[PDB]
Design a protein around this ligand. Structure first.
Ligand SMILES: Nc1ncnc2c1ncn2[C@@H]1O[C@H](COP(=O)(O)OP(=O)(O)OP(=O)(O)O)[C@@H](O)[C@H]1O
Ligand SMILES: [Mg+2]
Ligand SMILES: [Mg+2]
Lengths: 200, 477, 321
């Protein structure tokens, strides 16, 4: 009845792109898990959703609030999602069999700040370093390069993933925005972005 | 998207059998030949309740248990856009596809016997190349092949309970399995079913879209009355198990006579040697002669198929791709063209040349005086048919090499060449051929009422009736 | 496997009936023997079941027409699908005059025993034309229990007595013929009218004669025979009316003249001749396929709701009342 049920019918039964002008925190986790359980209730096909956070404490808190799901829904950090969904099944199909399959992220020794010396130390030494500039992402640039290169990676993430739920967009690089725009424009994935009122 | 092939090695009565497939497959054959061991090869590949018990000693070829059981299925996958089932496959696989080989897929099954634990373990694989097949990942009792395919196996008061259970199975496949690729395996659905319900099941099975993928084993010709866009698989009854495949389609030129062709061919698919005759007069004469000479001809796999007003290509292509022997007995005819006088076409020779792989001949023109008609016009046309049969002799010899038997004029002149003293005795005319050709359906019954033994043998061991000796199959060598 | 285990079990039961039960009267009760069996084994079981003397007494329930291919000296029981359970019995015998065409009759009648309304036609041209018309108008006619039965060169009494004793509706569409006698010129016997009068329970009519000049032949002799058939069909009008009351449908001349009365402007359009009737009758199998390749919807309805094709409306079963 009346405008409260009409506003709930507007904000629950959406199907398009969602962009809410809300602050950081203040009960956004409860409406995020309510939107996640409403999207899991409303879906009946074989598609799956994704949830990207920063810290592991909010990831296990979200995993405590959902519980168990058998639809193949992924909830995790951005580096784990890029590593376990983009890089590892498709590096052998994009750049040949000379590159290794298993790899560990050890950035405590190498401080190399170029792409060419980074690709020759994945070729030779088989380890990845970090840039001297802290506003860089080597792994997201590699994921964008092998998503531009491989066809079956685009076929898999067009066939499986339906929506991506993004948390903590206030501290992010432009390469993650470029990769998420590349997922948005061509392969038809909706975006759920929370943010900040001003600065913070 | 589409099934393409199955390769079965070292299973129960298949040593190395490769079968081309499609969607809507119908397998048929004899008794104890391996029709339901084909469907158990699909149950061990794609269904988990059969696969959870492993293999026994008796699942190996000739109880050997030193070879490897290998069952490989090929999928086509050429339509990534517009088909939801290709996305259903591709969203689970994730790591064995290659962009250079993105339009083929392989799902394989391997098994080697232990011979200490007395157990055959089943290891499943997929890949996009036949080399480098990685294992299907899984945790516990569940692997990732079970997330894609759902296999519904159907095997049967009575009758109305089975047609209720078909609606229960279709209701559960419509409701609970929208996100999965459903494959039906139907084992003999004609059991305790009336034939109107068999024609209704054939119409629902081939015309509706609710059965996208099935493998059907049957013994009934009335459940193939509506067959179109299907793959027919025949298991041969020889000393080696051979499975032949044909992609059955009905052309748009034959769409006005489709039900007549489907009833006539669907009765003929369950035979070994099929004789193709023209009308019911040949059926009456050949049924009397084959009743008197070899009366168990249809027990042993012979069939008389009356085909009329067609061009022989559909039946010969369907019987030849399935490994069934086809014999054609026909006569050359001079068909008169519409809107044109004196110009005839060479219809029986054009039908045999279109069967052999050649083009149609040119239209001949013979002219007659206008007062000369009646029986003399038919004698001039018979002399023109005899000149056609004399001048095209080397084509008639290679028709004879491909089991096609073209008459000189008609059946009745060959019958006068065989038993024409008895035809003079019965009809008591100076023209026994013309009195037979006046009313064909009543004088053939009058003729076969009065023949006896040693006239049917004079039909049978004549040299103009070697199609009957081909149909029975008795050879001197 | 299957099948050969069932045929082994039949020989086990026949060996136990031959050995252990010589002093008893053995009755077999067979419930549906076509189950998981090939059709050549069904014809072999039919030949063993009706020709051999090792099954003296049986009661047989079946669904298979191929296992009734050898039937003679048997009792056919049909259970009706109406609101009251009615069983109809017929003593099926094949006569000594029909012994040369026995297998054709048993295959054709054995497919027709499992129907409800049977239309009896002459040859395959009626089968081609009626299969095209019933495909375009009412395509589920055989799901509902309709059947097309070609009966060629027979006198209709065997099929009508077997279907009438079992409560199966028989419809006959035929045409009156003038058959020329052997050893005689100018004397024609009335074939189709004697067939319909023999079905009604009458005697055969006398042999009529008609004289023609000897130079007059070809198309003109067929026109003299057609107007003679029209005078026979005009003068025996009260016999044609009581054939029509007993679901017997006699044409005036042929099927083709009724088709020219129904769709004759389309037959002038397709064949582009002034005589489309004679061109189809020059070659009946190839020109019927050529005609039904070029008809469409609203020609098949012009055949179906014509007054000379009420046998199709009897076969479908749609009534105005
Ligand atoms: N392990 C095995 N080694 C050798 N032969 C085997 C083995 N397992 C089965 N067979 C043979 O395979 C056949 C099994 O018959 P099956 O039931 O597959 O036939 P079918 O064509 O389905 O029969 P039906 O038409 O009667 O239903 C038999 O000939 C049997 O001897
Ligand atoms: Mg079987
Ligand atoms: Mg029962």
């Amino acid at each position: 009845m009346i405008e409260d049920e009409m506003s709930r019918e507007q904000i629950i039964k959406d199907g398009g792109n969602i962009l809410v002008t809300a602050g950081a925190g203040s009960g956004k986790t409860t409406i995020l898990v309510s939107k996640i359980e409403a999207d899991l209730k409303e879906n009946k096909t074989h598609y799956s959703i994704a949830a990207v956070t920063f810290t592991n404490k909010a990831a296990k808190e979200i995993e405590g609030r959902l519980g168990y799901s058998s639809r193949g829904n992924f909830i995790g950090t951005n580096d784990g999602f890029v590593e376990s969904e983009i890089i590892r099944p498709f590096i052998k199909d994009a750049f040949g069999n000379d590159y290794p399959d298993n790899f560990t992220a050890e950035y405590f020794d190498n401080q190399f700040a170029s792409y060419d010396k980074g690709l020759q130390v994945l070729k030779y030494q088989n380890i990845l370093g970090t840039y001297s500039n802290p506003k860089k992402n080597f792994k997201f640039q590699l994921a964008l390069d092998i998503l531009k290169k491989s066809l079956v990676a685009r076929q898999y993430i067009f066939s499986k993933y339906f929506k991506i739920f993004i948390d903590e967009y206030q501290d992010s690089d432009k390469d993650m925005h470029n990769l998420f725009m590349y997922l948005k424009d061509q392969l038809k994935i909706k975006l759920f972005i929370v943010g900040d009122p001003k600065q913070s | 998207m589409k099934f393409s092939n199955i390769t079965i090695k070292n299973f129960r009565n298949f040593e190395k059998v490769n079968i081309n497939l499609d969607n809507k497959n119908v397998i048929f054959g004899m008794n104890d030949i391996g029709k339901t061991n084909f469907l158990y090869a699909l149950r061990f590949l794609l269904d988990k309740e059969i696969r959870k018990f492993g293999f026994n000693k008796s699942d190996y070829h000739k109880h050997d248990t030193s070879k490897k059981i290998e069952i490989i299925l090929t999928l086509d996958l050429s339509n990534y856009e517009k088909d939801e089932d290709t996305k259903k496959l591709i969203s689970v696989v994730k790591g064995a596809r290659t962009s250079a080989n993105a339009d083929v897929f392989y799902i394989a099954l391997e098994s080697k016997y232990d011979d200490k634990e007395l157990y055959g373990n089943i290891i499943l694989k997929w890949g996009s190349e036949l080399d480098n097949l990685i294992d299907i990942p899984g945790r516990g009792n569940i692997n990732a092949l079970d997330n894609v395919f759902k296999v519904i196996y159907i095997n049967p008061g009575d009758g109305r309970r089975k047609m209720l259970s078909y609606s229960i199975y279709n209701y559960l496949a419509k409701k609970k399995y929208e996100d999965k690729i459903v494959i039906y395996l139907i084992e003999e659905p004609e059991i305790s079913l009336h034939r109107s319900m068999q024609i209704a099941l054939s119409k629902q099975l081939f015309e509706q879209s609710t059965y996208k993928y099935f493998f059907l084993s049957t013994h009934s010709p009335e459940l193939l009355y509506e067959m179109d866009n299907t793959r027919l698989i025949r298991v041969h009854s020889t000393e080696k198990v051979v499975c032949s495949s044909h992609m059955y389609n009905v052309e748009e030129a034959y769409g006005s006579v489709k039900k007549k062709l489907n009833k006539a061919l669907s009765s003929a698919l369950f035979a070994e040697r099929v004789l193709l005759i023209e009308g019911p007069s040949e059926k009456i004469l050949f049924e009397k002669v084959l009743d008197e000479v070899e009366p168990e001809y249809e027990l042993n796999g012979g069939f008389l198929l009356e085909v009329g007003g067609t061009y022989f290509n559909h039946y010969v292509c369907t019987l030849n791709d399935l490994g069934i022997t086809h014999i054609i007995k026909t006569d050359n005819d001079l068909k008169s063209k519409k809107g044109k006088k004196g110009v005839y076409e060479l219809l029986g020779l054009n039908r045999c040349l279109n069967l052999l792989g050649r083009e149609n001949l040119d239209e001949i023109t013979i002219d007659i005086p206008e007062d000369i008609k009646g029986k003399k016009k038919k004698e001039r046309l018979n002399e023109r048919k005899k000149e056609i049969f004399k001048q095209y002799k080397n084509e008639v010899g290679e028709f004879l090499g491909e089991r096609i038997y073209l008459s000189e004029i008609d059946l009745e002149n060959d019958l006068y060449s065989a038993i024409g003293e008895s035809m003079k005795r019965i009809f008591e005319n100076e023209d026994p051929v013309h009195y037979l050709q006046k009313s064909k359906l009543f004088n053939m019954v009058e003729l076969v009422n009065n023949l006896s033994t040693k006239d049917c043998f004079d039909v049978f061991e004549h040299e103009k009736f070697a199609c009957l000796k081909e149909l029975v199959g008795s050879d001197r060598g």
